[PDB]
């Protein structure tokens, strides 16, 4: 049995969970659930990313402490993820004592090992508020076209890009004061020292080909030292021996993966597992599910930080593309920027889990939630292919056979075709070829419904003396359903619970080798109802 630690990217504490987050957390959860079904020791770890200037300023605007604000959003996030049945073993915070101690430890080791440099830089500073301004907190007049009220390093009228130091009549977004250039000592992590190590990782064949190709572009451009400090005022961890300096959020954020695992171990009273998973000699596997926009941090800075502080590196990064809705980036004006909480007011979690899983693969590709296709595909595949095998057969079993399935399989050869597919389906889940797994499962569902059609139970049921035939046919259909629901168990947790209640058995991967024979099933009310476009229209309207 493998030991596996899986993470999803840590959501920022200053925004609600939306469908883009859900693509990532669902992808990881399906994989995790499959790994658990195969008997491995799995630790699925996440946390909120709770530090930084935007969070500090948002709390001040609200008139509450950053601690109060991040606590409220942590609860909101966890409520939403729980509503999608994301099965974390721990959900922590980057604002935690575990992360503080690990961040200080890693920094101290990097510094002792020669990988931290000090250099003075010049940056725009708000002298009224008394703080350095990140680019997006500077506004002013575009130097090229002279359009007013442009933010940061680009103009939204003419498209020009420039340093915010080129803005005409610049103003602080925080206070309205004119910012000025001011010097400050910063601490830099010497990423270039790890170039050769990182290039060897890129060539090893572990990473997605598309990621390795992108890393070659980054090596070609040239790795640079990374500014890992920020001046007070800041919401984050103060740097030891450097009063008024804090770790930049992105230094502490991936350390939060470690902090969340440490927290889990400590709450369990487990004094051995942290080192077993994070020491250089670990035989455990470490996987990060992440999106395209944060690959640089996870493929360059993070393995280098770990190497330089005597910790093991990720076994692999699993990168996914962006979500689109109706083919386009989510759009607030069109009502396609959809929050996870809003989704659940209109649809169940399983429907979105299924739809995303049917489109996901081991490559980086944007995943399109086409809302018309969502209705058609959920209805066709879940209602009319898979659940249909239970719903068309269970009534006869309950009403005419006292709930008891036949004592032998009617078609053992067909059953073996279903169980023989377990190897290819499992390998598809394992390899993250989720769309392939779904295609194989739905091809089997088509075969199962073809079998039932060929036996014509709606004819058999009306014909004198054919009770045994009817029980045989319907039991066969229910056994095929048992197998398909096992293959779909990582994808559809709530439907699976309903199926397990009907079948009076827990679904296990190996259990499909023993069909249900001479076995009592329970009645059910609909396992899964149809959806329609009126519900989609309501979701979109509610999201505007
Ligand atoms: C250590 S992963 C941090 C991810 C970051 N909060 C983001 O949402 O992009
Ligand atoms: Zn302009």
Output the domain CATH number for residue 450: 1.10.730.10
319 C-alpha vs ligand 1 centroid, how far in Å? 13
Asked whether 42 lines ligand 1 (CB < 6 A), one says no
* Angstrom distance (rounded) from CA 192 to CA 181: 28
Closest C-alpha to ligand 1, atom 1: 254
- Chain centre to alpha carbon of residue 28: 5
Please say whether the beta carbons of 29 and 87 come within 8 A: yes
Count of Cβ atoms closer than 10 Å to residue 332 Cβ: 10
For 258, other C-beta atoms within 10 Å of its C-beta total: 24
Question: Residue of the nearest CA to atom 9 in ligand 1?
Answer: 294
CA atoms within 13 A on the CB side of 215: 26
Nearest CA to ligand 1 atom 8: 11
Taking the mean position of all CA atoms in its chain, how far away is CA 230?
A: 29
123: which strand partners?
182
CB-based contact 494:310 (threshold 8 Å):
no
Radius of gyration of the chain (CA): 27
Does 371 lie in the same domain as 502?
A: no
Residues 358 and 428 in one domain: no
Q: Is 137 in the pocket of ligand 1 (CB under 6 A)?
A: no
- Kindly state the tokens that stand for 13: 């504490």
**Which atom of ligand 1 is the closest one to the Cα of 256?**
1
Phi and psi, residue 226, nearest 5°: -110, 120
Query: Which ligand 1 atom is at minimum distance from the Cα of 254?
Result: 1
Using the atom order of ligand 1, give the atom closest to the CA of residue 9.
2
Residue 543 contacts residue 337 (beta carbons within 8 Å): yes
Q: For residues 130 and 232, give the distance between their C-alpha atoms in angstroms, rounded to a whole number.
A: 9
Q: Residue 166 Cα, ligand 2 centroid: separation in angstroms?
A: 11
Closest ligand 1 atom to residue 290 Cα is 2
Token pair, residue 193, equals 């020292």
Judge if the beta carbon of residue 294 lies within 6 A of ligand 1: yes
Q: Is the CB of 314 under 6 A from ligand 1?
A: no
Atom 3 (ligand 1) nearest CA: 10
- What are residue 316's phi and psi, to 5 degrees? -160, 160
The answer as to whether 17 is a domain residue is: yes
- For residue 231, the CA-to-ligand 1 centroid distance in Å is 21
**CATH for 80:** 3.40.50.620
- Cβ-in-10-Å burial (0-12, 13-18, 19+) of 238 comes to middle
6, 9, 297: residue to mutate for ligand 1 pocket, most atoms within 8 A of CB: 9
- CB burial of 380-417 (b: ≥16 within 10 Å; e: otherwise) equals ebbbebbbbbbbbbbebbbeebeeebbeebbbeebbee
For residue 12, give the ligand 1 atom closest to its CA.
Answer: 6
In a domain, 536, yes or no: no
* Cα–Cα distance, 326 to 185 (Å, whole number): 48
Which whole-number Å values give the CA distances from 41 to 60, 258, 280, in the listed order?
A: 43, 17, 19
Phi first, then psi: give them for residue 515, nearest 5 degrees.
Answer: -65, 165
- List, comma-separated, the residues after which the chain is broken, a break being a C to N distance over 2.5 A; otherwise answer none: none
Segments forming the whole domain that contains residue 42: 1-137+173-385
- Do 365 and 409 fall into the same domain? no
How many Å apart are CA 167 and CA 174, to the nearest integer? 16
Sign of the Cα pseudo-torsion (468, 472, 473, 477, in order): positive
Q: 177 and 159 share a domain?
A: no
**Distance (Å, rounded) from C-alpha 171 to C-alpha 178?**
5
- Cα–Cα dist 38/33, whole Å: 9
Output the CA–CA distances (angstroms, integers) from residue 48 to 150, 179, 295, 349, in the order listed.
31, 32, 18, 21
Domain membership flag for residue 47:
yes
363 to 213, 291, 315: CA distances (angstroms): 13, 12, 17
Q: For ligand 1, is residue 253 a contact (CB within 6 Å)?
A: yes
Q: Are 322 and 292 in contact (CB under 8 A)?
A: yes
Half-sphere exposure of 54 (CA within 13 A, CB side): 9
Answer with the one of 385, 401, 423 that is the final residue of a domain. Answer: 385
Contact by Cβ (8 Å): 330, 324: yes
Instruction: Verify whether ligand 1 is closer than 6 Å to residue 9 (CB atom).
Output: yes
Give the whole-angstrom CA distance, residue 410 versus residue 419.
15
- Distance (Å, rounded) from C-alpha 320 to C-alpha 210? 11
User: For the sheet containing 41-48, what is the strand order?
Assistant: 90-93, 41-48, 3-8, 285-291, 316-320
- 163-167 CB contacts, 8 Å cutoff, 24+ apart: 164/124, 164/133, 164/135, 164/138, 164/140, 165/124, 167/138, 167/139, 167/140, 167/141, 167/142, 167/143
Method: X-ray
Determine the distance from the C-alpha atom of residue 533 to the mean position of all C-alpha atoms in its chain, rounded to a whole number: 27
State the distance from the centre of ligand 2 to the C-alpha of 146, rounded, in angstroms.
6
Cα(350) to centroid of ligand 1, in Å? 25
Is residue 465 included in any domain, yes or no? yes
Distance between CA atoms of 425 and 487, rounded to whole angstroms? 7
SS3 for 383? helix
Q: Using most ligand atoms within 8 A of CB, pick from 10, 93, 251, 254 the residue to mutate for ligand 1.
A: 10
C-alpha–C-alpha distance, residues 361 and 416, integer Å: 27
Does 354 sit in the ligand 1 pocket, CB within 6 Å? Answer: no
d(CA 463, CA 461): 6
Single out the residue in 324, 353, 385 at which a domain terminates: 385
- Between strands 367-369 and 323-325, the pairing is parallel
Q: Which ligand is nearest to the CA of 167?
A: 2
50 C-alpha vs ligand 1 centroid, how far in Å? 10
Same domain, 116 and 152: no
Query: Is residue 105 domain-shared with residue 199, that is, in the same domain?
Result: yes
Q: Are residues 519 and 474 in contact, defined by beta-carbon separation less than 8 angstroms?
A: no
How would you list the strands of the sheet with 138-141, edge to edge? 150-151, 138-141, 168-172
- Write the CB contacts of 471 (distance below 8 Å, at least 6 apart in sequence): 396, 397, 400, 401, 405, 406
Distance separating alpha carbons of residues 185 and 231, to the nearest angstrom: 9
Do 261 and 355 lie in one domain? The reply is: yes
Q: Are strands 168-172 and 90-93 parallel, antiparallel or unpaired?
A: unpaired
Burial label for 115, CB within 10 Å (0-12, 13-18, 19+), is buried
Within a domain: residue 397?
Answer: yes
481 and 368, same structural domain?
A: no
382 close to 481: Cβ distance less than 8 angstroms: no
Q: Are 184 and 121 in contact (CB under 8 A)?
A: yes
Question: What H or E segment, with its residue span, contains residue 355?
Answer: helix 349-359
C-beta atoms surrounding 459 within 10 Å: 10
Q: Is 490 exposed, middle or buried (0-12, 13-18, 19+ CB in 10 A)?
A: buried
Among all bound ligands, the one having the nearest atom to the CA of 148 is 2
The reply to whether 529 falls in a domain is no
Q: What does each C-alpha distance from 4 to 13, 38, 255, 286 come to in angstroms?
A: 27, 12, 18, 6
SS3 call for 476:
helix
- Asked whether 10 lines ligand 1 (CB < 6 A), one says yes
Distance CA 78, CA 87 (A): 11
By C-alpha distance, which of 230, 213, 59, 226 is closest to 132? 230
231, HSE (Cβ side, Cα atoms, 13 Å)? 17
Q: What's the gap in Å between 73 CA and the centre of ligand 2?
A: 36
**Tokens (6 digits) for 43:** 């630790």
Geometric angle at alpha carbon 83, from 295 and 316, rounded to 5°: 25
What CA–CA distance (Å, rounded) separates 449 from 428? 23
Cα 328 from Cα 337, distance rounded (Å): 11
488 CA distance to ligand 2 middle (Å): 52
Backbone angles phi, psi at 488, to 5 degrees: -90, 0
Output the six-digit token pair for 447: 């075969």
CA distances to 81, 96, 101 from 237, rounded to whole Å, are 27, 10, 10
Relative to the CA of 49, which ligand 1 atom is closest? 6
Residue with tokens 């959003």: 73
Q: How far is the CA of 504 from the centre of ligand 1 (A)?
A: 42
Q: Which of 115, 149, 172 is the last residue of a domain?
A: 172
CA distance 112 to 81: 40
Q: Which residues contact 392 (CB under 8 A, 6 or more apart)?
A: 452, 457, 477
In 10 A of CB 178, how many CB atoms?
A: 14
Q: Taking the C-alpha atoms of 325, 330, 331 and 335 in order, what is their torsion angle to the nearest 10 degrees?
A: 60
Residue 105, SS3 per DSSP: helix
Ligand nearest to the CA of 168: 2
Shared-domain flag, residues 192 and 54: yes
- Best residue among 92, 294, 299 to mutate for probing ligand 1, ranked by most atoms within 8 Å of CB: 294
**190 close to ligand 1 (CB < 6 Angstrom):** no
Q: List, as ranges, residues with CB under 5 A of the ion ligand 2.
A: 142, 144-145, 147, 155, 157-158, 160
Task: Output phi, psi for 320, to 5 deg.
Answer: -120, 165
As given in the structure block, the two tokens for residue 300 are: 């360059």
Q: What share of the chain is helix, strand, coil (3-state, %, to 5)?
A: 50, 15, 35
Q: Is 27 in contact with 309 (CB distance < 8 Å)? A: no
- CB-ligand 1 contact for 12 (6 Å cutoff): yes
**DSSP classification of residue 380:** I
Q: Is residue 532 part of a domain?
A: no
Residue 233 has φ and ψ, to the nearest 5°, of -75, 140
378 C-beta closer than 6 A to ligand 1: no
Which residues, 6+ apart, have CB-to-CB distance to 124 below 8 Å?
132, 133, 138, 164, 165, 170, 179, 180, 181, 182
Count of domains in the chain?
3
How many Å lie between the centroid of ligand 1 and the Cα of residue 10? 5
Secondary structure (3-state) at 203: helix
Count of all residues that appear for the chain in the document: 544
Strands 3-8, 41-48: pairing kind: parallel
Residue 487 covered by a domain? yes
Query: Are 395 and 368 within one domain?
Result: no
Say whether both 228 and 277 belong to one domain: yes
Going from the C-alpha of 99 to that of each of 94, 223, 258, the distances in angstroms are 6, 27, 7
Q: Are residues 249 and 316 in the same domain?
A: yes
């Amino acid at each position: 049995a493998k030991k596996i630690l899986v993470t999803c990217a840590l959501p920022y504490a200053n925004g609600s969970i939306h469908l883009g987050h859900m693509l990532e957390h669902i992808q990881a959860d399906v994989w995790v659930r499959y790994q658990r079904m195969r008997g491995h020791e799995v630790n699925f770890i996440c946390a909120d990313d709770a530090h930084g200037t935007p969070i500090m300023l948002k709390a001040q605007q609200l008139g509450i402490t950053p601690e109060q604000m991040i606590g409220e959003m942590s609860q909101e996030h966890q409520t939403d993820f729980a509503g999608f049945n994301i099965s974390y073993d721990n959900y922590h915070s980057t604002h935690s004592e575990e992360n503080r101690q690990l961040s200080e430890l890693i920094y101290s080791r990097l510094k002792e090992n020669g990988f931290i440099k000090n250099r003075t830089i010049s940056q725009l500073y708000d002298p009224e508020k008394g703080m350095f301004l990140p680019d997006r907190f500077v506004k002013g007049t575009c130097p090229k076209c002279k359009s007013p009220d442009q933010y940061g390093d680009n103009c939204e009228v003419c498209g020009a890009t420039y340093s915010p130091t080129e803005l005409i009549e610049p103003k602080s977004v925080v206070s309205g004061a004119t910012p000025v250039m001011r010097d400050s000592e910063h601490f830099f992590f010497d990423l270039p020292s790890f170039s050769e190590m990182l290039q060897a990782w890129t060539r090893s064949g572990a990473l997605q080909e598309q990621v390795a190709n992108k890393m070659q572009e980054w090596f070609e451009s040239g790795l640079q030292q990374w500014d890992i400090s920020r001046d007070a005022p800041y919401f984050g961890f103060e740097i030891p021996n450097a009063p008024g300096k804090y770790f930049y959020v992105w230094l502490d954020a991936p350390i939060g993966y470690m902090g969340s695992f440490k927290n889990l171990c400590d709450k369990r009273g487990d004094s051995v597992s942290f080192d077993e998973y994070w020491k250089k000699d670990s035989t455990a596997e470490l996987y990060h599910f992440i999106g395209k926009d944060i690959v640089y941090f996870h493929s360059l800075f993070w393995p280098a930080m770990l190497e330089g502080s005597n910790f093991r590196k990720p076994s692999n990064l699993f990168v996914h593309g962006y979500v689109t809705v109706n083919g386009a980036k989510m759009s607030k004006s069109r009502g396609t920027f959809i929050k996870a909480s809003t989704w659940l007011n209109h649809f169940d979690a399983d429907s979105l889990r299924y739809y995303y899983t049917a489109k996901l693969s081991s490559r980086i590709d944007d995943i399109d939630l086409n809302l018309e296709d969502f209705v058609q595909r959920v209805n066709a595949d879940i209602v009319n292919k898979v659940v249909n095998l239970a719903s068309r057969n269970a009534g006869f079993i309950n009403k005419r056979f006292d709930g008891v399935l036949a004592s032998e399989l009617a078609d053992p050869q067909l059953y073996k075709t279903f169980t023989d597919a377990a190897e290819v389906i499992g390998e598809a889940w394992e390899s993250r070829e989720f769309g392939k797994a779904v295609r194989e499962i739905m091809a089997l569902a088509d075969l199962a419904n073809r079998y039932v059609d060929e036996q014509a139970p709606w004819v058999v049921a009306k014909q004198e003396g054919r009770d045994a035939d009817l029980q045989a046919i319907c039991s066969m259909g229910i056994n095929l359903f048992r197998v398909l629901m096992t293959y779909l168990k990582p994808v559809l947790p709530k439907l699976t619970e309903r199926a397990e209640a009907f079948l009076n058995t827990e679904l296990t991967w190996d259990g499909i080798q023993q069909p249900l024979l001479g076995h009592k099933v329970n009645p059910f009310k609909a396992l899964y109802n149809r959806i329609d476009m009126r519900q989609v229209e309501a979701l979109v309207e509610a999201s505007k």
